[PDB]
Amino acid sequence: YSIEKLKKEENSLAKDYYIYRLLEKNKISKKDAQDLNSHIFRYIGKIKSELEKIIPLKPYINPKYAKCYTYTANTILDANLTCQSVRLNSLVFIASLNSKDRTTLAQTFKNQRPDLTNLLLAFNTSDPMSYIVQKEDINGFFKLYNYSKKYDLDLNTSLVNKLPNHIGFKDFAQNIIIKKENPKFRHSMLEINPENVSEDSAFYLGVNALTYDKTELAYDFFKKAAQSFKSQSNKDNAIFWMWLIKNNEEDLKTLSQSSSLNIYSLYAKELTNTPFPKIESLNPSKKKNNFNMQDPFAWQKINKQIRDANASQLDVLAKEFDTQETLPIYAYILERKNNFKKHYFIMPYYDNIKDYNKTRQALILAIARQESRFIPTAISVSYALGMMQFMPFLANHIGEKELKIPNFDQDFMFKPEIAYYFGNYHLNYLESRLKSPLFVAYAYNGGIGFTNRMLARNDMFKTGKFEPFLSMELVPYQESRIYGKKVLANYIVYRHLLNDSIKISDIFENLIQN
Ligand SMILES: CC(=O)N[C@H]1[C@H](O[C@H]2[C@H]3C[C@H]4[C@@H]2OC(=O)[C@H]4C3)O[C@H](CO)[C@@H](O)[C@@H]1O
């Protein structure tokens, strides 16, 4: 489709994908690209940097403060007082000034903006973080952390307990704990009162406390996380820790009776001889309908209707799409429609995988459920394609160089036959090197480079009191940490449905290297 037909379609990730594809093939003229900013659902990342190679946009700065960016560190004392304050938002700017000008600007600002005063005087020292910490300036602490992550220093109880009141705190704690940077910051965060944190912050501080073997503080942190978490999956992750640390059976019972199906609730059910949860069964009699499951545009359309529906338009959609041909959509609508209380694990386009061994089938289906919910024409924000969410680099390399498919286009990933076959091929490569389906899941999402780098560390997936569950919490990419846990649960479930059950404790045992 030409840029002109693309312009007639609604903004969406599909449209973006296709505009990107013209860009990468250099088929968009400077003229085509004029009105094109209005035609991009999500102007971030690749399509942005690619369209800015044609029409650079170097904006934007408000007409108000335009005079203010005509001054440099050399001429800043000639600037009016508003301009002075604007430029001092940048800690790099402040670092650029000489110390005489910092002293002067610091006196100007001590009345109305002592935040500025403190940063100004801080950069007149060999250690700005220490100066800020001594003044207990919370806003300054975070501006310094964002400016430079290499500042590290011990923080007292008074101070650490103020940090969680700032929006930066969560990202700050997550980062330094899973990356294992700022050891003095980490050690100091052992004195945060659990009362003062909640949710993810509380959870990550529980993980922190485990790493220093402070199991009491860890429980309190995990407990506070259990009581505050919005989603049940996260509550469960926290209840599981509560149990592992103390071993109260009230905790494990709550976890075995969870409405959320996840690895922690599954493991707990196994440990308590609780029966496997009820998996729905969808077998629509209706054979097909009008809907083109191979049209990416139709999907994005119907996907917006499903998202933006009262739980009553849903029942109109559910019935419209209650067919064998639109089964993946049916299950998608149903999942939302029953408020995520029912467990849907379909096996669509099964003829394409029925001749693989059942353990392989489970792995493929588990990946596809998380990647796509089995939507053939699914496109991610990084433009990963189809049910198995292949990046176009990898899809083209497999399809052109390896499997030598004739007339291979990357849009072939929209075909179930192909998605499942390339999925099988790529998983074969990963399994043969990594073995565990959890490790395979990490590498399917984050690449095998990152996974091998992680497994080579001697603090990851080794033996230890709290292993392998602690390592699972310390996987360094957030997206991959979450992905693994989910795909693993999907794997258990699908092995079960396939009559190829495995104890999840068996999976956890083979995560440890001896
Ligand atoms: C289409 C899409 O955005 N897919 C992405 C996937 O997101 C799914 C999840 C979260 C949403 C999204 O599409 C769905 O149907 C739900 C299941 O997440 C993965 C990382 O975990 C991504 O690797 C994958 O590309």
Coordinates of all heavy atoms in Angstrom, one line a residue, residues 443-479:
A443 N 15.3 -15.5 27.2 CA 16.1 -15.2 26.0 C 15.2 -15.0 24.8 O 15.6 -14.3 23.9 CB 17.0 -16.4 25.8
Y444 N 14.0 -15.6 24.8 CA 13.1 -15.3 23.7 C 12.8 -13.8 23.7 O 12.6 -13.2 22.6 CB 11.8 -16.1 23.8 CG 11.0 -16.1 22.5 CD1 11.1 -17.1 21.6 CD2 10.0 -15.1 22.3 CE1 10.3 -17.1 20.4 CE2 9.2 -15.1 21.1 CZ 9.3 -16.1 20.2 OH 8.5 -16.2 19.1
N445 N 12.6 -13.2 24.9 CA 12.2 -11.8 25.1 C 13.4 -10.8 25.1 O 13.3 -9.7 24.5 CB 11.4 -11.6 26.3 CG 11.0 -10.2 26.7 OD1 11.6 -9.6 27.5 ND2 10.0 -9.7 26.0
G446 N 14.5 -11.2 25.8 CA 15.6 -10.3 26.0 C 16.9 -10.6 25.2 O 17.9 -9.9 25.3
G447 N 16.8 -11.7 24.4 CA 18.0 -12.2 23.7 C 18.9 -13.1 24.5 O 19.0 -12.9 25.8
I448 N 19.6 -14.0 23.8 CA 20.5 -15.0 24.5 C 21.8 -14.4 25.0 O 22.4 -14.9 26.0 CB 20.7 -16.2 23.6 CG1 21.4 -17.3 24.3 CG2 21.4 -15.8 22.3 CD1 21.2 -18.7 23.6
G449 N 22.2 -13.3 24.4 CA 23.4 -12.6 25.0 C 23.1 -12.2 26.4 O 23.9 -12.6 27.3
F450 N 22.0 -11.5 26.7 CA 21.7 -11.0 28.0 C 21.5 -12.2 29.0 O 22.0 -12.1 30.1 CB 20.4 -10.1 27.9 CG 19.4 -10.4 29.0 CD1 19.7 -9.9 30.3 CD2 18.3 -11.0 28.7 CE1 18.7 -10.1 31.3 CE2 17.3 -11.3 29.7 CZ 17.6 -10.8 31.0
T451 N 20.9 -13.3 28.5 CA 20.6 -14.4 29.3 C 22.0 -15.1 29.7 O 22.2 -15.4 30.9 CB 19.7 -15.4 28.6 OG1 18.6 -14.8 28.0 CG2 19.1 -16.4 29.6
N452 N 22.9 -15.4 28.8 CA 24.2 -16.0 29.0 C 25.0 -15.1 30.0 O 25.6 -15.6 30.9 CB 25.0 -16.3 27.8 CG 24.4 -17.4 26.9 OD1 23.8 -18.4 27.4 ND2 24.5 -17.3 25.6
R453 N 24.9 -13.7 29.8 CA 25.6 -12.8 30.7 C 25.1 -12.9 32.1 O 25.9 -12.9 33.1 CB 25.5 -11.3 30.2 CG 26.5 -10.9 29.2 CD 26.5 -9.4 29.0 NE 25.3 -8.8 28.3 CZ 25.1 -9.1 27.0 NH1 25.9 -9.8 26.3 NH2 24.0 -8.6 26.5
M454 N 23.8 -13.1 32.3 CA 23.2 -13.2 33.6 C 23.5 -14.6 34.2 O 23.8 -14.6 35.4 CB 21.7 -13.1 33.4 CG 20.9 -13.6 34.7 SD 19.2 -13.3 34.6 CE 18.7 -14.4 33.2
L455 N 23.5 -15.7 33.4 CA 23.8 -17.0 34.0 C 25.2 -17.2 34.4 O 25.5 -18.0 35.3 CB 23.3 -18.0 33.1 CG 21.7 -18.1 33.0 CD1 21.3 -19.1 31.9 CD2 21.1 -18.4 34.3
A456 N 26.2 -16.4 33.8 CA 27.6 -16.5 34.1 C 27.9 -15.8 35.5 O 28.9 -16.2 36.1 CB 28.3 -15.8 33.0
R457 N 27.2 -14.8 35.9 CA 27.3 -14.3 37.3 C 27.2 -15.4 38.3 O 26.5 -16.4 38.0 CB 26.3 -13.2 37.6 CG 26.3 -12.0 36.7 CD 25.7 -10.7 37.4 NE 24.2 -10.6 37.2 CZ 23.4 -10.0 38.1 NH1 23.8 -9.9 39.4 NH2 22.2 -9.6 37.8
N458 N 27.9 -15.3 39.4 CA 28.0 -16.4 40.4 C 27.0 -16.0 41.5 O 27.0 -16.8 42.5 CB 29.4 -16.6 40.9 CG 30.1 -15.3 41.4 OD1 29.4 -14.3 41.4 ND2 31.3 -15.4 41.8
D459 N 26.3 -15.0 41.4 CA 25.2 -14.6 42.3 C 23.8 -14.8 41.7 O 22.8 -14.5 42.3 CB 25.5 -13.1 42.7 CG 25.2 -12.0 41.7 OD1 25.4 -12.2 40.5 OD2 24.7 -11.0 42.1
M460 N 23.8 -15.5 40.5 CA 22.5 -15.7 39.8 C 22.3 -17.1 39.5 O 23.1 -17.7 38.7 CB 22.4 -14.9 38.5 CG 22.3 -13.4 38.7 SD 20.7 -12.8 39.5 CE 19.6 -12.9 38.1
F461 N 21.2 -17.7 39.9 CA 20.7 -19.0 39.7 C 21.8 -20.0 40.1 O 21.9 -21.1 39.6 CB 20.3 -19.1 38.2 CG 19.0 -18.4 37.9 CD1 19.0 -17.1 37.3 CD2 17.8 -18.9 38.2 CE1 17.9 -16.4 37.0 CE2 16.6 -18.2 38.0 CZ 16.6 -17.0 37.4
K462 N 22.4 -19.7 41.3 CA 23.3 -20.6 42.0 C 22.5 -21.1 43.2 O 21.3 -20.8 43.3 CB 24.5 -19.9 42.5 CG 25.4 -19.3 41.3 CD 25.7 -20.2 40.2 CE 26.4 -19.5 39.0 NZ 25.4 -18.9 38.0
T463 N 23.1 -22.0 44.0 CA 22.5 -22.5 45.2 C 22.4 -21.4 46.2 O 23.2 -20.5 46.1 CB 23.2 -23.8 45.7 OG1 24.4 -23.4 46.2 CG2 23.4 -24.8 44.6
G464 N 21.5 -21.5 47.2 CA 21.3 -20.5 48.2 C 20.0 -20.7 48.9 O 19.0 -21.2 48.2
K465 N 19.9 -20.3 50.2 CA 18.7 -20.3 51.0 C 17.4 -20.1 50.2 O 16.4 -20.8 50.3 CB 18.7 -19.2 52.0 CG 18.8 -19.6 53.5 CD 18.2 -18.6 54.4 CE 19.2 -17.7 55.1 NZ 18.6 -16.9 56.2
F466 N 17.4 -19.0 49.4 CA 16.1 -18.4 48.9 C 16.0 -18.6 47.4 O 15.1 -18.1 46.7 CB 16.0 -17.0 49.3 CG 15.7 -16.7 50.8 CD1 16.5 -16.0 51.6 CD2 14.6 -17.4 51.3 CE1 16.2 -15.8 52.9 CE2 14.2 -17.2 52.7 CZ 15.1 -16.4 53.5
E467 N 16.9 -19.5 46.9 CA 17.0 -19.8 45.4 C 16.0 -20.9 45.0 O 15.7 -21.7 45.8 CB 18.4 -20.1 45.1 CG 19.4 -18.9 45.3 CD 19.2 -17.6 44.5 OE1 18.4 -17.6 43.5 OE2 19.8 -16.6 44.9
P468 N 15.6 -20.9 43.7 CA 15.9 -19.9 42.7 C 15.1 -18.6 42.7 O 15.2 -17.8 41.8 CB 15.6 -20.7 41.5 CG 14.4 -21.5 41.8 CD 14.6 -21.9 43.2
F469 N 14.2 -18.4 43.7 CA 13.1 -17.4 43.7 C 13.7 -16.0 43.8 O 13.2 -15.1 43.2 CB 12.1 -17.7 44.8 CG 11.6 -19.1 44.8 CD1 12.1 -20.0 45.7 CD2 10.7 -19.5 43.8 CE1 11.6 -21.3 45.7 CE2 10.3 -20.8 43.8 CZ 10.8 -21.7 44.7
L470 N 14.8 -15.8 44.5 CA 15.5 -14.5 44.6 C 16.1 -14.1 43.3 O 15.9 -12.9 42.9 CB 16.5 -14.6 45.7 CG 17.3 -13.4 46.1 CD1 16.3 -12.2 46.4 CD2 18.2 -13.6 47.3
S471 N 16.7 -15.0 42.6 CA 17.3 -14.7 41.3 C 16.3 -14.2 40.3 O 16.5 -13.3 39.5 CB 18.1 -15.9 40.7 OG 19.1 -16.3 41.6
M472 N 15.1 -14.9 40.3 CA 13.9 -14.5 39.5 C 13.5 -13.1 39.8 O 12.9 -12.4 38.9 CB 12.8 -15.5 39.8 CG 13.1 -16.9 39.4 SD 11.8 -18.1 39.7 CE 10.6 -17.6 38.4
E473 N 13.7 -12.6 41.0 CA 13.4 -11.2 41.4 C 14.5 -10.2 40.9 O 14.2 -9.0 40.8 CB 13.1 -11.1 42.9 CG 12.0 -12.0 43.5 CD 10.6 -12.0 42.9 OE1 10.3 -11.1 42.1 OE2 9.8 -12.8 43.3
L474 N 15.7 -10.7 40.6 CA 16.8 -9.9 40.4 C 17.3 -10.0 38.9 O 18.4 -9.5 38.6 CB 18.0 -10.4 41.3 CG 17.8 -10.2 42.8 CD1 18.9 -10.8 43.5 CD2 17.6 -8.7 43.1
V475 N 16.4 -10.5 38.0 CA 16.7 -10.5 36.6 C 16.8 -9.0 36.2 O 15.8 -8.3 36.4 CB 15.6 -11.2 35.8 CG1 15.7 -11.1 34.3 CG2 15.6 -12.7 36.1
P476 N 17.9 -8.5 35.5 CA 18.1 -7.1 35.3 C 17.2 -6.3 34.3 O 17.2 -5.0 34.4 CB 19.5 -6.9 34.9 CG 20.2 -8.3 35.3 CD 19.1 -9.3 35.1
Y477 N 16.5 -6.9 33.4 CA 15.5 -6.2 32.6 C 14.1 -6.5 33.2 O 13.7 -7.6 33.2 CB 15.4 -6.7 31.1 CG 16.5 -6.4 30.2 CD1 17.8 -6.0 30.6 CD2 16.3 -6.7 28.8 CE1 18.8 -5.8 29.6 CE2 17.3 -6.5 27.9 CZ 18.6 -6.1 28.3 OH 19.5 -6.0 27.3
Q478 N 13.4 -5.4 33.5 CA 12.0 -5.6 34.1 C 11.1 -6.4 33.2 O 10.3 -7.2 33.6 CB 11.4 -4.2 34.3 CG 10.1 -4.2 35.1 CD 9.5 -2.8 35.1 OE1 9.7 -2.0 34.3 NE2 8.6 -2.6 36.1
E479 N 11.2 -6.1 31.9 CA 10.2 -6.7 30.9 C 10.4 -8.2 30.9 O 9.5 -8.9 30.8 CB 10.4 -6.0 29.6 CG 9.3 -6.3 28.6 CD 9.6 -6.0 27.2 OE1 10.2 -5.0 26.9 OE2 9.2 -6.8 26.3

